[PDB]
Scaffold this active site. Structure first.
Site, PDB file in Angstrom:
ATOM      1  N   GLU A 212      15.027 -97.958 -45.218  1.00  0.00           N
ATOM      2  CA  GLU A 212      15.654 -98.618 -44.063  1.00  0.00           C
ATOM      3  C   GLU A 212      16.476 -97.674 -43.178  1.00  0.00           C
ATOM      4  O   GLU A 212      16.592 -97.921 -41.974  1.00  0.00           O
ATOM      5  CB  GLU A 212      16.579 -99.762 -44.514  1.00  0.00           C
ATOM      6  N   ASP A 221      14.318-102.649 -34.151  1.00  0.00           N
ATOM      7  CA  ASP A 221      13.345-102.152 -35.133  1.00  0.00           C
ATOM      8  C   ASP A 221      11.922-102.120 -34.495  1.00  0.00           C
ATOM      9  O   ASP A 221      11.806-101.971 -33.272  1.00  0.00           O
ATOM     10  CB  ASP A 221      13.398-102.991 -36.443  1.00  0.00           C
TER      11      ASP A 221
END
Ligand SMILES: COc1ccccc1OCCNC[C@H](O)COc1cccc2[nH]c3ccccc3c12
Ligand SMILES: CC(C)CCC[C@@H](C)[C@H]1CC[C@H]2[C@@H]3CC=C4C[C@@H](O)CC[C@]4(C)[C@H]3CC[C@]12C
Ligand SMILES: CCCCCCCC/C=C\CCCCCCCC(=O)OC[C@H](O)CO
Ligand SMILES: CCCCCCCC/C=C\CCCCCCCC(=O)OC[C@H](O)CO
Ligand SMILES: CCCCCCCC/C=C\CCCCCCCC(=O)OC[C@H](O)CO
Ligand SMILES: CCCCCCCC/C=C\CCCCCCCC(=O)O
Ligand SMILES: CCCCCCCC/C=C\CCCCCCCC(=O)O
Ligand SMILES: CCCCCCCC/C=C\CCCCCCCC(=O)O
Ligand SMILES: CCCCCCCC/C=C\CCCCCCCC(=O)O
Length: 442
Positions: A212, A221
């Site tokens: 992550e 993202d």
């Protein structure tokens, strides 16, 4: 020949310049930048001082000796020059040994990547390694304990124009093992253990930090969704003030789109908690979780954390294969999914973890693990450079005529060039790259 002396003269001159400049850059970067003033970097300055003394006081007089085929500095500087050379090699491998033992104590402590030494104790160790290596190097040479008794050796010591380091077989054996072979065996045994520890101490928290990442400011993202910290989805909505309000309710403060490292880790512990609770609450995931080992359990949480409990539960054929412990067949189906096509570099890491049940795919990914690999490279290249010289050193004690003087000096020069490689290995660290581009005004 006349083209050989100039041609080798120029390449020797370039080696001298590269050793001195590279090593003054390392020393001043650590001296001026606060971020670089660490215990490990104090040991690295000990190593860079030996390489700077090698560059100014050792390599230039060896270069003159080869080009002139004689010694033009007298019998006093000859013995002093050999002593500084021996001292520089002895202090270098002993400091590499100290770095291996220090990293071992750090990796087997609850602090994991912090030395158990204070910056004051580290300075004492460095002066202790430099004073002891001084005694074992200057004393046998200046006391003439090293000296051979055959006529070719005896004549060389008398004439001021000769500086060939002739030694008795007892000195050659004794100083080679105490100065080089003893710290080399400890370093390779102790540092193979630090790598072992690093890999077997990897957990789900370190696994997800790799996959992550860590950002303390709101970002988008791949799905274009607003995220913060270690993959904490704020909202699917395309509105920054709607994303900034989701932060304020989660933290209980007017964040203004920024989070502190202590706050982001609290959010992450809650997210991994929700993931593991979601698994044992699901009738399809709970039995597949129960049939998996600690590391394959990490790989399944990693998936639930990313796509949700309900998303992972849709992988019915893959889940059936994991339950029956058929890893390669689970892998074929997992690779034939949208999850794989969207994020493939993370999907093949989780899939490799399912195939092997090891942390091999997460190897040298963490910033702290990349740091342990750099140290390992410094250690490895030094041993590759100096071992042919030190091997032929004890082989010459067995049989004298086995190797010619020309190969002995060439194998010594391979050791000499190593003194210019270490600054280039420090470019692997972003901290050093930033200091270097600043010091070189780039
Ligand atoms: C032979 O003279 C040379 C001529 C041109 C260039 C280099 C030359 O070499 C100078 C000396 N090199 C020293 C070598 O570079 C350093 O060798 C050592 C380092 C540490 C402990 C040691 N214990 C030992 C026992 C026997 C022989 C060598 C060593 C030794
Ligand atoms: C040829 C010989 C005489 C020259 C050798 C130079 C000696 C004096 C050098 C080599 C390595 C050096 C050390 C390298 C590391 C540090 C860390 C720093 O935070 C304090 C000083 C200290 C402890 C240095 C003091 C001086 C030192 C011991
Ligand atoms: C700066 C460039 C240096 C390269 C210098 C290369 C030239 C090398 C000089 C050769 C020399 O000094 O000659 C010694 C010889 O013994 C006499 O007959
Ligand atoms: C020639 C060798 C000179 C060796 C002297 C260099 C040692 C001083 C040094 O590099 O230390 C920087 C700073 O004080 C660390 O915090
Ligand atoms: C050898 C001649 C010295 C030139 C030094 C130099 O190149 O300095 C500029 C540096 O690259 C800054 O970007
Ligand atoms: C001839 C002497 C050779 C090299 C000396 C270079 C060291 C001086 C640089 C220190 C200055 C600095 O970077 O702050
Ligand atoms: C032989 C001595 C080995 C050095 C001990 C360090 C601790 C360890 O690696 O287990
Ligand atoms: C094998 C010969 C030399 C090893 C080089 C030293 C570097 C430590 C590497 C640790 C390891 O063996 O994995
Ligand atoms: C690897 C090449 C590194 C340095 C080149 C200098 C080597 C000089 C040794 C010459 C040996 C000799 O002919 O006596």
């Amino acid at each position: 020949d006349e083209v050989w002396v100039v041609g080798m003269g120029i390449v020797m001159s370039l080696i001298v310049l590269a050793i001195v400049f590279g090593n003054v850059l390392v020393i001043t970067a650590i001296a001026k930048f606060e971020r670089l003033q660490t215990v490990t970097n104090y040991f690295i300055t000990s190593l860079a001082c030996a390489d700077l003394v090698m560059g100014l006081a050792v390599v230039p007089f060896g270069a003159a000796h080869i080009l002139m085929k004689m010694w033009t500095f007298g019998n006093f500087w000859c013995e002093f020059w050999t002593s500084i050379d021996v001292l520089c090699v002895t202090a270098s491998i002993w400091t590499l040994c100290v770095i291996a033992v220090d990293r071992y104590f750090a990796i087997t402590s609850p602090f994991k990547y912090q030395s158990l030494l204070t910056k004051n104790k580290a300075r004492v160790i460095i002066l202790m390694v430099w004073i002891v290596s001084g005694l074992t190097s200057f004393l046998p040479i200046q006391m003439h304990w090293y000296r051979a008794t055959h006529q070719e050796a005896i004549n060389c010591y008398a004439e001021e124009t000769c500086c060939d380091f002739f030694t008795n077989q007892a000195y050659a054996i004794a100083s080679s093992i105490v100065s080089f072979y003893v710290p080399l065996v400890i370093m390779v045994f102790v540092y193979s253990r630090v790598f072992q520890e690093a890999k077997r101490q990897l957990n789900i928290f370190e696994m997800l930090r790799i996959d992550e990442g860590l950002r303390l400011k709101i970002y988008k993202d791949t799905e274009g969704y607003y995220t913060i910290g270690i993959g904490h989805l704020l909202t699917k909505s395309p509105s920054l003030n709607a994303a900034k309000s989701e932060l304020d309710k989660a933290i209980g403060r007017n964040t203004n789109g920024v989070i502190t490292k202590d706050e982001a880790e609290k959010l992450f512990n809650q997210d991994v908690d929700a993931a593991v609770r979601g698994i044992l609450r699901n009738a399809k995931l709970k039995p597949v979780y129960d049939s998996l080992d600690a590391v394959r359990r990490a790989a399944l949480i990693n998936m639930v954390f990313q796509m949700g409990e309900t998303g992972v539960a849709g992988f019915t054929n893959s889940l059936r294969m994991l339950q029956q412990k058929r890893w390669d067949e689970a892998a074929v189906n997992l690779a034939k999914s949208r999850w794989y096509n969207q994020t493939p570099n993370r999907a093949k890491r989780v899939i490799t973890t399912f195939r092997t049940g090891t942390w091999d795919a997460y190897k040298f990914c963490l910033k702290e693990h990349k740091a342990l690999k750099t140290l390992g490279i410094i250690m490895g290249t030094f041993t590759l450079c100096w071992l042919p010289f030190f091997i032929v050193n004890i082989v010459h004690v067995i049989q004298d005529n086995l190797i010619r003087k020309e190969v002995y000096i060439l194998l010594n020069w391979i050791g000499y060039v190593n003194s210019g490689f270490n600054p280039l290995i420090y470019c692997r660290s972003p901290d050093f790259r930033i200091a270097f581009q600043e010091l070189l005004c780039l």
